[PDB]
Amino acid sequence: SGFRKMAFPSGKVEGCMVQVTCGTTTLNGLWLDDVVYCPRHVICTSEDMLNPNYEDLLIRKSNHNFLVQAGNVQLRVIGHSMQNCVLKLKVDTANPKTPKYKFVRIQPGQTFSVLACYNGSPSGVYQCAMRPNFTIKGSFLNGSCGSVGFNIDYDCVSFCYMHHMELPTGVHAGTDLEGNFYGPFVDRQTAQAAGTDTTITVNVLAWLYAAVINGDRWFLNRFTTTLNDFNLVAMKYNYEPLTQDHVDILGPLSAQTGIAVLDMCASLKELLQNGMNGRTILGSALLEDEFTPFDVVRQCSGVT
Amino acid sequence: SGFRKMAFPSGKVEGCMVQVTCGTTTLNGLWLDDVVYCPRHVICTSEDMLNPNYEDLLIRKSNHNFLVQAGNVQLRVIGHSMQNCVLKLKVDTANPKTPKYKFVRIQPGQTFSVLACYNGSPSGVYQCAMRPNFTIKGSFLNGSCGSVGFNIDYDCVSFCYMHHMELPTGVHAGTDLEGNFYGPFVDRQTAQAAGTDTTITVNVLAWLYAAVINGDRWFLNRFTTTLNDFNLVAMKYNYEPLTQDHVDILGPLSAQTGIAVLDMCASLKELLQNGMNGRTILGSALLEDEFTPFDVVRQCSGVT
Numbered sequence: 001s002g003f004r005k006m007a008f009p010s011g012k013v014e015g016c017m018v019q020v021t022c023g024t025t026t027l028n029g030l031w032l033d034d035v036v037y038c039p040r041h042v043i044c045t046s047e048d049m050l051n052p053n054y055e056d057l058l059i060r061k062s063n064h065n066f067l068v069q070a071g072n073v074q075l076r077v078i079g080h081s082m083q084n085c086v087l088k089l090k091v092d093t094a095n096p097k098t099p100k101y102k103f104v105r106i107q108p109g110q111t112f113s114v115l116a117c118y119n120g121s122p123s124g125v126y127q128c129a130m131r132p133n134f135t136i137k138g139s140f141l142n143g144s145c146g147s148v149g150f151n152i153d154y155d156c157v158s159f160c161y162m163h164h165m166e167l168p169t170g171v172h173a174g175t176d177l178e179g180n181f182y183g184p185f186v187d188r189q190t191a192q193a194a195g196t197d198t199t200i201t202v203n204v205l206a207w208l209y210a211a212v213i214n215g216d217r218w219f220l221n222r223f224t225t226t227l228n229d230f231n232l233v234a235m236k237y238n239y240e241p242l243t244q245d246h247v248d249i250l251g252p253l254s255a256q257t258g259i260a261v262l263d264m265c266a267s268l269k270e271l272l273q274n275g276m277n278g279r280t281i282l283g284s285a286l287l288e289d290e291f292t293p294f295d296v297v298r299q300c301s302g303v304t
Numbered sequence: 305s306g307f308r309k310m311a312f313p314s315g316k317v318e319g320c321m322v323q324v325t326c327g328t329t330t331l332n333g334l335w336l337d338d339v340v341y342c343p344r345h346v347i348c349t350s351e352d353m354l355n356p357n358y359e360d361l362l363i364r365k366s367n368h369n370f371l372v373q374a375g376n377v378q379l380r381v382i383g384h385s386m387q388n389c390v391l392k393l394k395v396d397t398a399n400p401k402t403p404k405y406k407f408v409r410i411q412p413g414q415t416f417s418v419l420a421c422y423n424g425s426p427s428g429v430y431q432c433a434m435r436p437n438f439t440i441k442g443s444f445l446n447g448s449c450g451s452v453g454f455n456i457d458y459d460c461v462s463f464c465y466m467h468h469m470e471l472p473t474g475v476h477a478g479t480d481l482e483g484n485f486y487g488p489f490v491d492r493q494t495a496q497a498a499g500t501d502t503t504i505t506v507n508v509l510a511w512l513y514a515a516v517i518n519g520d521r522w523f524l525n526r527f528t529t530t531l532n533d534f535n536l537v538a539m540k541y542n543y544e545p546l547t548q549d550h551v552d553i554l555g556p557l558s559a560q561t562g563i564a565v566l567d568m569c570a571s572l573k574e575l576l577q578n579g580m581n582g583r584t585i586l587g588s589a590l591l592e593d594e595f596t597p598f599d600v601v602r603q604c605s606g607v608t
C-alpha cells in the first residue's frame with residue numbers, strides 16, 4: 001500500500017565513490033576494478049571551460065597530477081586515458097567493494113537512481129529519468145560532477161549516467177560510462193539550450209495503473225479511445241506519441257487491474273482536457289512521468 | 305541547482321537488515337551489535353492479530369523458534385525479550401557492519417529515510433515524514449514489517465521508525481526502536497482511524513525558500529503578514545499553527561534569500577487563497593511539506 005518515488009538501495013555504489021583532484025578542481029570518481037572513471041573536465045580551470053581543447057590540456061597532465069582518494073587513503077595512479085568525455089585512471093589496487101556491474105546507455109523515459117556525492121562522499125540518493133530532450137532534472141551543486149546514475153538487477157549494478165554539467169536553465173547533462181553525452185550536449189561552458197521537455201506518456205499510464213492498484217480510482221471514466229485519437233491529444237499537450245510497443249509493455253499492469261490500456265488512455269485524455277479540478281492522484285496534483293512500467297511492477301511486487 | 309526528494313545513502317542500514325521468521329511469519333529485523341530488533345507481531349498468526357495477548361503468545365516461543373538469517377547465514381539466538389511492541393533477539397555474534405547509531409523518537413513534521421525491505425533484503429529507499437496525525441505515507445507490502453526509518457549525521461545513524469502496520473486507509477503506523485508506537489496506534493487488526501492529516505507549515509515555508517534559491521520565484525508577492533493573521537489562514541486550510549520557534553528555525557533560509565519569514569508567510573497565504581493557477585513550484589502542483597528547514601539547508605549546501 002502507498003506508492004513512493006523510490007531509489008535503489010545505494011550501498012553497492014557508495015562502495016565505489018572516490019575523490020579525484022586535478023590541480024584546484026575536486027570532483028567524484030567511480031572506482032570499479034582497477035579503473036577510476038571521472039569527467040574529463042577535472043583537468044579544466046573555470047577559464048579552460050569556455051573553449052577547452054581536452055587533448056591539448058591532457059598533454060600537460062601526468063599520472064601523479066591525478067589525486068585519487070578512497071575514504072582517507074590515497075590510490076596510486078599508474079595510467080590515464082581519455083575515452084570520449086570521461087577519463088579512465090588506472091590505479092594499482094582493484095576496488096575490493098567492486099559489485100557485479102555493467103555499463104548501459106539508457107533511452108529517454110528510462111528512470112535511474114542518482115547517488116549525489118561531494119569530495120567522494122555520498123550526500124543523498126534520489127530517482128531521476130532521462131528526459132525526452134536528454135536532460136535530467138537532478139539536484140547537483142558544484143563538486144557533484146562524477147556522481148553516477150544506476151539501476152540494480154538483484155546484485156548487478158547497471159551504471160547509466162555520470163554527472164558533467166548544469167545548463168543555464170538549471171537542468172543537468174551528462175554521459176554514459178563510455179563518456180558519450182546524452183543528447184547534443186558538450187562539456188564546454190557555452191550556449192546549450194534544451195529542446196521541448198515532453199511528458200513520458202507510457203510512464204504516466206504506468207503511474208495511473210499504480211494509482212488504481214493503490215485505491216486512487218476517481219479519474220477512471222466510462223470512455224475508451226484509439227492510439228491515433230489519443231496521439232492527437234498527446235501531441236496537443238506535448239506528450240510523447242504512444243506506440244503499440246508501449247501498449248505491449250503495459251500489458252502486465254492492464255492484466256493486474258483488468259483496465260484495457262486504451263481505456264486508461266481515455267482516462268488520461270480526460271485528465272489532460274479537464275485538469276485535476278483540485279484533486280490529487282497518489283499525492284500528486286500533476287501527472288507523474290518518472291515511473292516506468294517496470295518500476296511500477298517492481299514497487300507493487302516488492303522485488304529485492 | 306534543482307531540488308529533489310532526497311533520501312540518505314542507505315548502505316550503513318543495508319548492513320543491518322536481516323530476516324526474522326517465527327513459524328509461518330517472515331519479516332525484517334534490524335541487527336545492531338548482538339541484538340536483532342523486530343516487530344513483536346512476528347509471533348502472531350493473521351488470526352492472532354484480531355485480539356493478540358503478546359505476553360501469552362510469547363510464553364509459547366523459545367529462542368530456537370526465532371529464525372534469524374543475515375544474507376544466507378543463520379544467526380544463533382541466545383535470548384529474547386519484549387520491549388513495548390518490539391522483540392529484542394540476543395544473538396551470539398555482534399553485527400560486524402554495525403554503524404555508529406542512536407535510537408531517537410522524532411516529532412511530527414520531522415522527515416526520515418525508509419529502507420523498504422522484504423526477507424531481510426533491501427528493495428528501495430525513499431523519504432517520509434512523521435505526519436501530524438502520527439501516520440506515515442510509505443510504500444509497504446506484506447513482508448515489509450521491520451523495515452526502518454533513519455537519519456544520518458555524518459557517520460552516526462539515528463534510527464527513528466520501524467514499520468509495523470497498514471491502516472484500512474492505506475497509511476502506515478509504526479514504532480520507535482524502543483517499541484513505542486507513534487500516535488495512538490496498536491499492533492492489532494482493529495478499527496484504527498487516523499486524525500486530520502494537517503500540512504506541516506514550517507516545512508512548506510522551507511520548501512518555498514528552496515524554490516527561491518533554485519530560481520522558482522513567480523509566487524513571491526508584495527505583501528507581508530503577522531503570525532496571528534497567517535495562523536487564521538493556516539487554521540482555515542488545515543495547516544499547522546506557525547510558532548515563533550518555527551520562525552527562528554527558518555532564520556538561516558531567510559538570511560540566505562533576504563526574504564523575511566513573515567513575507568514568505570504572506571506568499572504562502574496568497575498561494576493558499578488563490579491556488580497555483582496551473583503553475584508549478586520545483587516541479588510540484590501542490591505545496592510540498594516533507595522537507596524540513598534542516599533538509600533544505602543540507603541539500604542546498606551539499607552535506608555528506
Ligand SMILES: O=C(NCCc1ccncc1)c1ccccc1F
Pocket residue numbers: 140141142143144145164165166305
Ligand atoms: O558553483 C556554482 N555553479 C555551478 C554549479 C553546478 C551545478 C551542477 N553541476 C555542476 C555545477 C556557483 C556557486 C556560487 C555562486 C554561483 C555559482 F554559479
Ligand SMILES: O=C(NCCc1ccncc1)c1ccccc1F
Pocket residue numbers: 001444445446447448449468469470
Ligand atoms: O498482504 C496483504 N495486506 C497487508 C499488506 C501490508 C502493507 C503494509 N504493511 C503491512 C502489511 C494482502 C495481499 C493480497 C491481497 C490482500 C491483502 F490484504
